[PDB]
Amino acid sequence: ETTALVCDNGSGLVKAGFAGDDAPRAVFPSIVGRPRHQGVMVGMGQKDSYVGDEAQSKRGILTLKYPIEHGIITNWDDMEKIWHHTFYNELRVAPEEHPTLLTEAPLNPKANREKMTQIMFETFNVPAMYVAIQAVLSLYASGRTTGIVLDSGDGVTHNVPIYEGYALPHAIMRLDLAGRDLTDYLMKILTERGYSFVTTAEREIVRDIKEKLCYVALDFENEMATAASSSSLEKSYELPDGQVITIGNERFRCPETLFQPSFIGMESAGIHETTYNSIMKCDIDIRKDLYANNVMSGGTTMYPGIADRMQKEITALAPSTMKIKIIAPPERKYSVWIGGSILASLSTFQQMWITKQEYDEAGPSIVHRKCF
Amino acid sequence: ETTALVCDNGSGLVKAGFAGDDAPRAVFPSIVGRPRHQGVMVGMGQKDSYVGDEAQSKRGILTLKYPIEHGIITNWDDMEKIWHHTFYNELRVAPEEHPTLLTEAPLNPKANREKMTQIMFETFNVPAMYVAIQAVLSLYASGRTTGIVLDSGDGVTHNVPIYEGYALPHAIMRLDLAGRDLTDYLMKILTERGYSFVTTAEREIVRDIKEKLCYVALDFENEMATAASSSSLEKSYELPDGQVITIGNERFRCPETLFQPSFIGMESAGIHETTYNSIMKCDIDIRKDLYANNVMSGGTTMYPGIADRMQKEITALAPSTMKIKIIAPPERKYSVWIGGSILASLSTFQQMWITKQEYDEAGPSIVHRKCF
């Protein structure tokens, strides 16, 4: 039979593919570029907008916009360009023919779902659609029915306690620090050493520095004193033009804002204490099963040492005889997509789709009724 | 008691004087000239380098270097000549005997404060030193404890939200357009009318044209159409040799790059939208008090009509019932110095100085510890 498409609209990347695939067929940055300079050469073949890897390749010429931030779609014409590029150019598939499983972060505006449905049925004429909470899919991806999923993207971080297949919607924490606020903090701190990264194309060098060289300290104050006392932590990277830049204690300082959001001037507590505060909202019978099965998910958890720092720093909070275990599979960057791929292939799922008949009857409001 | 010296190292001017004075005793361009021609006449009395007004007077014979650009000190031997000239020739004061309050733009490299301290204690042997953020002083100068200071120099522009005496360091914007990039744009556009100004001495004619004849349009497109349609805006100026040059729509076009940095090929937004984007990073309880108390500061805000254009163009951004107020005192060129003069004279301040004893104990790193 026709497979469903499975598509995950991160803030940072699009992952897309067919249900039953083991890994996503298309991954590219969800970015739209426009030329910001006079077009001098006649007959070059101008283009109004680049998308994804095209906009990465040209990015010296372009202003780069992200059309999703904090999991909210903030201008629709770009997001529609990104989906158009996903179906027709990256997957090369007619959306006429496949159900589409979309994805959303919990507790975000109700308008976002309605629009995200309206555009699938009016623009792409999809046969049937669904929208699934990100943190639920990471449990399918990790073989579990019980756990507290910490999921962190480019734009949003959230905890969702799930016990025996029941979500506990009063206990859902959402926290709005993510890889993008780490990147803006990294630019601000890098400025201390004289390196200044200003433009949208130049921000995305800093993003690559963060990915390659950052790591999480297992004692922030001890490594602060160490790197204040030794060159041993100092490490170096080449900019695209061949300038070499050298980066020291600062490389652990940026992912530390996940554990001390006050560095960004964010009042809220770090990911460890919002995880513990999520388990403390659950019924006392299930805390023992949520102290095991802490599942990490999404790219902002890819930093070296984040699992050890989490286990250490929850174990300082939790009672002394609960076995704290953090579960961080190495593919956790893709785990939301892998779990969507499993979910879309279950036969029990095939009743759940919102079919076009139902959207015609109900209008887009149906997405709240026929969905979590 | 001994007064402190108060000295402000702009990119363009040095202002220096004694604490408790109402206005600076020495103002001169922070420029160092060296002779670039064969010395024909024997016994004239050669000099290796001129500084300040000496280099202005001779400037036909000299290459003029600015040793600070973008608030960063880019070669130290010149800057040390400029300070030597400030203490010994302009103030006529032994630096052995007075504390010195220096000044700096926020968020610039940390090696600049270290060197700027090391040179005060080793070279000039000052008893005690301090370094203060420029935009903080303009609030002392304008009688306020709350405001968002827009400060624009020869080299750097920055916004610093301050509420009730607390800075909000995550909301600090720094923008790298300033009077010198306006001057280089002015030279480029003036070339359209046939006037070409090429050399460093000749640049400093254009700087004086910019100061005398430029103004900010209250509607850029309407005055563009006007000056394209009428001689009424066309105005004329004498070069040093008596050539008259005539300047039209172009005279408003150069300060417009502050509001449309794309004219220079600068990707970032103008000073208005960075001000609004600075207020949007502050907590919602304080925005009402940061929408009043927009304080203009520094020379690049001296253009006729810039306060009106700011108020107009923020009022298009802010919600319709916030009272937008721009505060632009006529001495705002000196307001950073005036606020330094106030700060250095408070008795509560006399504990804050970095005394040489402490620099001997700690070394120059102390400047980060004992200072903002």
Partner: peptide
């Protein structure tokens, strides 16, 4: 968002 955060 609509009021609190910028999105």
């Amino acid at each position: 968002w609509x009021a609190x955060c910028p999105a």
